[PDB]
Point group: D2
Chain length 267, copies 4
């Protein structure tokens, strides 16, 4: 397989619609041996991870918890063996309180909420890299998930700002990881119908945000020269696996778009 024998840490599974669930599924199908992390609802997460193709141990990780981060390498070493290291790490983690993403006015998001969203969505890409690099092999690969924030848009609001920050963090992570022969890259995915995204369709964020999301999705598939299926996470998972593989060995600090080509077309 594409990832035969590689040991890969996958963060960010919470449901079977999580992008990270599909990353993990494809990685296992491609021969990878996974370690998974979960935040908060560990019992619920294990129910989900048992439906992956193969067994994988689950470790707790709250990226705001410095004790979790400081112990993470040693906890990984306990499960993969002290003499073994990881070849890949996937950051598939994001959060922004409703005040910063949705129908609340952009100007009205309190700093404490934006700061928490920035912590989880952008700063933690650096935190995770710092925590895992001591147990990563030379030639390894760190991959995070992005949503193209080059231009402003309805509703995404401060999450857009967090993604812009994340892209900048990735370039500095690449500097540090490169010293020990590890690549760092983001995959900028088009919109994917997770459970939360289905709730937006149903008006959970507000009817206005629901209309804006539909407008975005229809235009995305239209613009994309090869189309875009929001209900199919597999192309995104495959692209992450491509970056975890040895087939893009000279790409780092970079952003690879798994978006149907939509961002290359104006209309």
């Amino acid at each position: 397989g594409l990832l035969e024998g590689k040991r890969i840490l996958v963060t960010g599974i919470i449901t079977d619609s999580s992008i990270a669930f599909h990353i993990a599924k494809v990685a296992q199908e491609q021969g990878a041996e996974l370690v998974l992390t979960g935040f908060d609802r560990l019992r619920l997460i294990e129910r989900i991870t048992q439906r992956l193709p193969k067994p994988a141990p689950l470790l707790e990780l709250d990226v705001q918890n410095e004790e979790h981060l400081g112990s993470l390498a040693g906890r990984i070493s306990e499960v993969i063996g002290e003499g073994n290291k990881l070849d890949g790490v996937v950051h598939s983690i994001g959060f922004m309180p409703q005040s910063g993403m949705g129908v609340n006015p952009f100007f009205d998001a309190p700093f404490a909420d934006v700061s928490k969203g920035f912590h989880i969505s952008a700063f933690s890409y650096s935190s995770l890299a710092k925590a895992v690099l001591p147990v990563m092999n030379r030639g390894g690969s760190i991959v995070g998930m992005d949503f193209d924030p080059t231009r402003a848009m309805p509703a995404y609001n401060w999450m857009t700002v967090a993604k812009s920050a994340l892209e900048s963090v990735n370039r500095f992570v690449a500097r540090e990881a490169g010293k020990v022969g590890v690549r760092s890259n983001l995959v900028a995915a088009g919109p994917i119908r997770t459970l939360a995204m289905s709730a937006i369709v149903g008006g959970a964020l507000g009817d206005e945000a629901g209309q804006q999301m539909q407008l975005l999705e229809e235009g995305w598939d239209q613009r994309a020269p090869i189309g875009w299926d929001m209900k199919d996470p597999t192309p995104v998972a495959k692209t992450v696996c491509a970056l975890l593989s040895d087939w893009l060995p000279a790409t780092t600090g970079d952003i690879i778009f798994a978006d149907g080509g939509a961002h290359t077309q104006l209309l």
Copy 2:
């Protein structure tokens, strides 16, 4: 003059080498009537502002202080008159603790420090816009200061991340300000020899950062097709005044480079 009769708020003066000091000087030379804001050391700041071409009132503003922000419009109205509004606002504010900018490893900056730097350097562009827009005229202009963060670099570290966030914030400020006919733009300046920058030359951040800064500055002037004089803030001040004027009336959400053209040349 270029700004004849325009009422403009200028933040960010702390020394006579502050970029904002030169923005204020050129604006006054061009006919603008200024309101100034200062942070913390008001007595020291007034000593500086008395050396500007013309008198200007000074109001206190700590952008982390929500009481200062909430009262700012009314305090402006008290000095310019209740029936009058501002035509221009300049954000020339930045901060990052030494743990996030300098020789400290990128991975070792504590979140609390990065969060404070993000608050002052990026979030506050939105906070200031929210505070001032109620007292801004249609046709007005908000301008902030940027340092091109498209690529990573030595020492700038988390300030680079804050600038990447600032660029994203600017695009959302433009959305909001556009509703009431106000433009929002950043000026990406080349390196300017402020007092703090002279301290880096002298090794205050560390000899390694001093060498990196010299390497950056020499290359900047070399790359720039028209050269770059770090000891001359006037071209930057003029560019800010251009954006405050009525001569770029269809530019918003954007970044104008006052950098000698350096960013357009690889070497």
Copy 3:
């Protein structure tokens, strides 16, 4: 005025809807003394230029004609006086045969047609600069017109490719012009209702291109935080004059957007 006393060459007037007509009008209103150039239909152009604020001299210039280019500096000197020099030059020239812009398939444009369009629309920015620089003052400014080609789009086709080339040419012109103290920049304008653009509305390029143009224009005004009026060339003309002035003295090799901010917003 903004351009008081400056001597400026303006290419590209063919009708009173030409962007160059409005550049010339605003520049004269701001005190510039113009030299105009015209291609082919010189008698028609003279009739149009008599509608400008002030009568100005007209020189013939076909940018594909090396004799016109080689004689241009001397012909300028005959108009402005021996020993006098230009302060500004405006390139407002474009062309693409119908095989390369419109409803003809992208793959079906013959090379000879694309080459001619590349010659007039991109290569000639360099040719014009070479021809005029010997009679330009230090501190001068060369400005060309762009339509953002970062993303592909319907109908614009090989003209998009020519604009991508033009942006690259501009960065090299800036290198050469900077040696003699002259800036070079492009203004990326939103869509403007010239007579030819009105013909597209009327279906002259085909009903499909008419529909695509309407879709582009409606979306442009929607996206632009300050709106976009295709029937108002004045904001574009003002922006060109800003770059011809002394108020952006550290910007070269660059692209300034006069587009309502539309390119900074996804939707």
Copy 4:
């Protein structure tokens, strides 16, 4: 292997240092069955291609020759079998006469030379796609070679302009190819020590271009977080194969950087 069973056309082999030679070598090692094309020196190319892992058929293709292009699909079918189709196509073709790339002044390149270089280096990406798409499978992939032209640089001159045009062409090829389920992308490679590049080191383009090339290459390896070995084309070849594979199925109209991460770092 990564490309098991795929039928792939590879243009651009002239020496065993050609990037296309290494693309072909890796593709064969990964199970692809190749059709090769060669320009002009067919007997010399045959001698080179016999050094590949597996003997492969060679077709003549001058991309300026419309008869070669119009007959190409039928000639491919004669080689692969009537009814069979290609899965991948590699454009690894470039040319610029010495007047347009080297030490000759940018302004002094004659149009005829720039036009020829534009024809071969940019227009032909579209010509090749038009010629091959009728014999490409759905799910196929077209890949071309790029050198990042976002910023100007010494010596590359009009070849930089051709690459800027090529990137724009690629976005339009993606539009057309997407209609039949085919992706189109470019790989932006760092500098590779081909025989011609070795000649630059030896001063064949002039001592000044030799010095500029060395400065570019030393800086490239320095900037790249994972380093850059100009003498190792394999990472570039692997990246092209990644795009020819099924592992980046949602990327089109795009540019993937195989450059060590250098373009993401300022210094």
